[model samples]
Structures are given as C-alpha cells and as structure tokens.
Target: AAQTNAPWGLARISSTSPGTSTYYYDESAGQGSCVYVIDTGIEASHPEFEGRAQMVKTYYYSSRDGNGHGTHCAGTVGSRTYGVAKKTQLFGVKVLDDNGSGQYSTIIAGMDFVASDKNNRNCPKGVVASLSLGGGYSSSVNSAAARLQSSGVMVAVAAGNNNADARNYSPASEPSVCTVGASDRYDRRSSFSNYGSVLDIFGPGTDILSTWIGGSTRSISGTSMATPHVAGLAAYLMTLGKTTAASACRYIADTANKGDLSNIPFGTVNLLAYNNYQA
Candidate 1:
C-alpha cells in the first residue's frame, strides 16, 4: 500500500461554504459568550482572525501548528473576518501538538483549564466548547463533558471523520453533548462521518469554506470543520437556555436534511431531522 497524506482530513465528508453574509446574527452574541476551539492552535496571524481570538491569553500545551485545522474550525464558530458569528469570541487551546495528534491526558487537561478558568475577569459569560477531533470512547472525559452541560456550557464534539461503523468519542459521546456527524454538499451523510447510536447531529462537513493560515482561503473537509458549525449554532441556541441540550439537539435534527442511513446498523441520528428549522 502506498502511504499518502490527506491535508483535509476525513475522506467521508467534503467541505461546503457556510454561505456568505451570515456574520454573527446570534441574539446571544450580546450576552458575551465565548467558544473554545480545543485542538491544535490556529494560525496566530491569519488576517481573517488576526488578533480577534482570545488565544493570546489562553492555555497552550504546544507551540504546535499552522496546519489550518484549528484556524478553520475557529472561523466556523466566530470568524467575522470570514465567518457567521462576528461578535462571538473564541479561546483557542492547543491540545494536539504540531503533528495534529496527542494523548488523552493532555486533551483532558486542556478541557479542564477552559472549563475551570476562574481568574480572568473577562471570562465568557457562557462558553460553547468545540472539538474538531475524536478518537474512541472515553468514559471519564465523557463524564466531564456531561458535567459541563449540567453547568450551562454547550459542548459540540466531532463525530469521527472516518468511514467506519463504530460511532463513539470522548466529547461527542457524552449523552449531554452534541455529537456532530458530517454531510456532503447535497445534505447527505458523508461517507466518512462516523455512524452509530452515539451520533447526535449532522452538519456540513464536506469541503467547507472558511478562514485558513495567514492570508489564505479555501474549502476543506473533515469532522473538524463539521464540529464548529454546530458550535456556532450552539451560540445561536444559547439564546434559548430554557431549551435543554436534548431540545437543542432535536432542533438540529429537525432542521437537518433527512439522510439515507439504511446502511447504519443502529440508525443512531435522524438525518431528516436536520433539514429545515429555526434556532
């Protein structure tokens, strides 16, 4: 077998532009909510973001990367420079090192830092944490994610961007979390988005259009890109705190384009549920 590198991770999903003109209309933007992108750090100099991210004062475990994954994900949730949520802020936590991979301890520690931060007076009123990465299930971390949901934070985790049948991951698998699967431009399930009972919602994970490294733009694919879309939506949904995570998830499902999930042995998520709806 020949070894090759995939710049846009996850072959099952293609990237789609989040459309144009959606520059942060969330009513909760004024509520001063901040979202944390837990992954490799974003490009510290990307103009679309430039000095906009809260990363300057964030906790970083690695000088890590400029590979564009975190930057792209960051834009999806709060990129007014080229995003839907202009007023929303982001805390970029570098969990994965330069190579785009890391261990569970580090990931958990980073989550703890953001979730437990107390010293900063500018801390977000409420945070929506976005994870564009996933591995196998982690009961302990899932517990932690669930705890956040109980506390008022919204956790949106990536459904593994792989062409596999098993669907379970740390941040996404938590019963209280929004486990985001992927879809293509046509609104069908992406061949790579993980499938299973653990799947909670689906989003545009295909070649998504968003900000990239310093002064660049392009469409890229992966659950990484897919995760932030939900994170952004969570910001929109936070305006409805009277609604629960399950209800918000139901909104995402009810709004998602119904998909062909017959091959799915367990039929975890409702594809049709995501088609058309309101926040």
Candidate 2:
C-alpha cells in the first residue's frame, strides 16, 4: 500500500494539492532500478536504508560519512521510510570530504566511475546518477557530465544554492543532465535555489528530513536535497520502461506539473516534479 502518512517532500510530489500529506505510488516503484549518490558518503548501515545502500566508491580516505550530506541525500532517494523510490538500490560514491568540498577532478572521477560500473550496465531497469553538489562553471566538468549521459545514465544534478542563474554552474549548466531546483512544501521556489533556463525541474528541498550519519535523521535545506527526488523519480520511471536516459528525461518533463510553483524567475521553467501517481 502507498504511504498514507508520508514526509512532506514525498507527499507533495505524488499529489497536485499541496495540502495533501499522503503519498500514492506504484507497488513496483524503483524495484529494479539503481541510483548512484555522488556526494560525501553514505552510512550504509543506517537503519532507514534497510541494507539497500552501500559505499561502492570513494575518493576520500574513508568510506564512512563524516559529513551527513550524502546519507541525507541517499535517504531521500531510496530509504524505506523517507525515499522517493523505496525499492531502489543505492550506490554511494564519495567525492567530497567531511567538509563537503572536492575538486573538479575528483568530481569528474566519480562521474566516470558510475559510467563504468558493471552493475550500471547489467541492471535490468534504469540507471541514475544523483549529484547533490556543484560549483562554478567548468568546461571540463560539463564535458564529463555529457559523457556520463552518453553512457546511458540518467544524471540528476542540483542547480545550486547561489540564488543566481544556474547557467553559471558546471554540472547544472550541462545540457545533457537534468538540472533540478529547490521548492518548498507550499509550492514556492526556495529562496536560495538557483534558477534560469538551465533548470529541468523543481523538487521539494526546504527543511527536508532524512537519514543522518549516526543512525539518526536530520532536517536541512538546499538544492542538494532536491536533486535526489528527481533521481529517484527517474529510477521509478525506468521501472515503467523509460529505460534510456533521454526517454526518462523526456517523460519527467512531460509529466511534471507545469506552472504549479510560485516565485519562479524569468526564463526558468515553472514545472514541478511529479511521480505520475494518484490515489
């Protein structure tokens, strides 16, 4: 059964009415899909993950999550209680250190790792790479993201928290990826979310609650929190046979609730992410 009492982020995407708090979803939601979380690192042992999350790659010295960002983002993507796709497999690719910072070379290396993962290829369903981090425009980063997409992986990236044009960011500005902005439960764009024509969609991001590093949960805000929702949604869509990156991206845009969010900047699309599920 679908969750009758769900987190605001999950509930909002499943219903057109912002007042609703129930999440209606398919029974097979993301059952065969895989989502790669490229961030700090995940506490795979976190109870919320139910053993579905694992640290598959890491640039930092340790695979453990000193910074809670990665665990939180992973939870939103596929935790049993907080996820957008409850049954998806989560692969934690640690690029950032405990301070939540990393170089473009390491970031691109993380992208490349996902692109070459054997599981990414053998998976019977959709493969998605979720990036909850971004920086200033780098042609090299953009090129790497393009190459990742060319590998048939659906890439979902944060538009950034700068509250400026996302066109100034690297992965967000990359045309081949799905750049996501942040929105609040009230269907309003988050004050800190970057905007512009580069954004592919909006997802719930303000004060979102998800798993933490110490077997707990935390609430935080940023476009970083929004990208995973799109990643999980893309994973779920893949279960419905939108397997290719291009097809899933097209389906997401076409099915999104258009003109549903308020305070959108000029030239930015007013589309909000929706899972195409109803009660």
Candidate 3:
C-alpha cells in the first residue's frame, strides 16, 4: 500500500480557494434547489451562514461539535458566494457520532431518516443529496440510498483515502453511486485514492478551504473535499433543465476541464474526454 501525507502531484484536483470563485455562485443557482449533506454535523447558526442555511432536518449522533468534516463539506457545496453551488439549500444530517465514527447500522438508520423526503420538511425542497462519507464495502444496500436514487435524488460520494487496488469505501465503491476521486490543482489523481474500474468520476479535493470552528479556516485534504464540486456542478446542471439527478451528473463529467495530464503517469481522470466521448 502506498503511504503519503498528501502531495499535489499525486493528489486530488485542487479547486479555486473558497471565497474566491464567483462563477459558481451566479444567477443560475438563485433559482432554488435544496441539497442534503450527510456527514458528521454542522453549526447551522454560524455567521458565515448568516440568515442562510436553513435546517430542514437534524440528526445527531453526537451533541458536541461533530467532526468538522461535515461543516467543511457543506461549505464547499453552499457557503454562499464561496462554494461551487452557492444558492443550493442544505439539510444537515449528523450520522457519525461526535467522535467522527459510526457503525454501519447507525449510518443506515440515520440515512433512512434523512432520505425520507416527507419527514424532512426542514430539508431542501426537491433535494439532490451530496454524500461526503463512506465506509468499507458492504453487500446490503441501505434503503435511503435506493429510495433517493429511485426518486431522482442525486448523490455523489467520496472514493476514499485508501491506497490499494480495491476501493476505499462501499457507497462510493458501489455501481449505482456516483463515485468520485480527488485531484490537485493541476488535476491528477492522489496516490492515496482508492481507484480502479469502479471509479466513476474525478473532482477537486485537495487543500480545500471550507468551514471551520470558532469562525476560523483551514485547508483539509481527501476525497471527501472533492465530492462537493461534482455535487455543486450537478446543481448547476439541474438548473439548466437537465432535471433528472443522474443526467445532471452526467453533464458535469461531460463538461469539466481536460488536457495536460503528463504528471499523472499512472492514469488521469479526464473530464473533457469523458464529456466529449474521446478516447
């Protein structure tokens, strides 16, 4: 297994630092589309969120500040004028315990609740979920995963931070799920990312500047960060009347940047090629 502290040449495609890209927060997203964020937990009252960030549903495995992971992921997707999908509403569902860990059963139970569009009146209306967490492989498919997919809910997952031939997590590893791997600013797959034929797409996930506690900020690394860019892009596609969740995702993979991948000698995930149908 390859071990690394996270390097750019072999890491996720880096993104425009948060609070810098205004292109993502344009009139297109203003139309209103809700997104569900399934992760640790978030500070719904944080000022960066302002009057924004309505919590349509709340699930807690930990009363304390859940892992900052969920918050960072949310900020990446919809931090208003910062994230890739600025106007998309978010539903905070805390599945992981405060320790940032949870058994599959607990995650499945929490997902069932978050996945229920009817019970989640506080969640975004016509939501397309952006899932940032995943565990090892599993045979049983969670009901939430199935129901949401069947109901036109869009989901993008992290490919995981494992360095092995097999993938890192199950949800992302699954065929139905839109699995994503991380890359650096130049767009090269991280040496540590779980990859293979199972990999469905790629996104920026390195040195991400998203939400943090005490109103502070920091750069985090992992496939977790990369997942949101695709989620946000999907939101943009949805706005174009590409409406179906799955179809919207197909557009993102079809339209993202491509070219110059010599650094990634192993292999590179080319958005331009996939979108253009070029080999």
Please give the CA lDDT of all the candidate structures. Answer: 0.62, 0.90, 0.59
Overall local distance difference test of candidate 1 = 0.62
Compared with the true structure, model 2 gives a TM-score of 0.97
lDDT digits (tens) for residues 1-279 of candidate 1: 111222222111112222222222334441465677888887756666646675633234445345678888988776654443445667788887666776877777777776675235253445677888767778877777676656556778887866664334666667677888777655556778777777777766777777776667788888777788777666555543533443566566655545444334456664622212222
10 residues in a row with least lDDT, candidate 3: 270-279
TM-score of each: 0.77, 0.97, 0.79
- Those runs of model 2 whose alpha carbons end farther than 4 Å from true positions after fitting are 119-122
- Provide the global lDDT of candidate 3 against the true structure: 0.59
Summing lDDT over every window of 10 consecutive residues in candidate 2, give the lowest-scoring window. 118-127
Overall local distance difference test of candidate 2: 0.90
Off by over 4 Å in 1: 1-31, 56-64, 118-125, 166-168, 239-247, 254-266, 272-279
Local accuracy of candidate 2 as per-residue lDDT tens digits, 1-279: 578778899998888779787888888879888999999999999989988889998987898899999999999999988899999999999999999999999999999999999353446786899999999999999999998888889999999999999999999999879999999989999999999998989999998989998899989999999999999999988887755676677678888999989999889999888987754
> How many steric clashes between backbone atoms does each model show?
20, 0, 12
Error in Å for residue 258 of model 3: 3.9
Residue pairs in collision within model 2: none
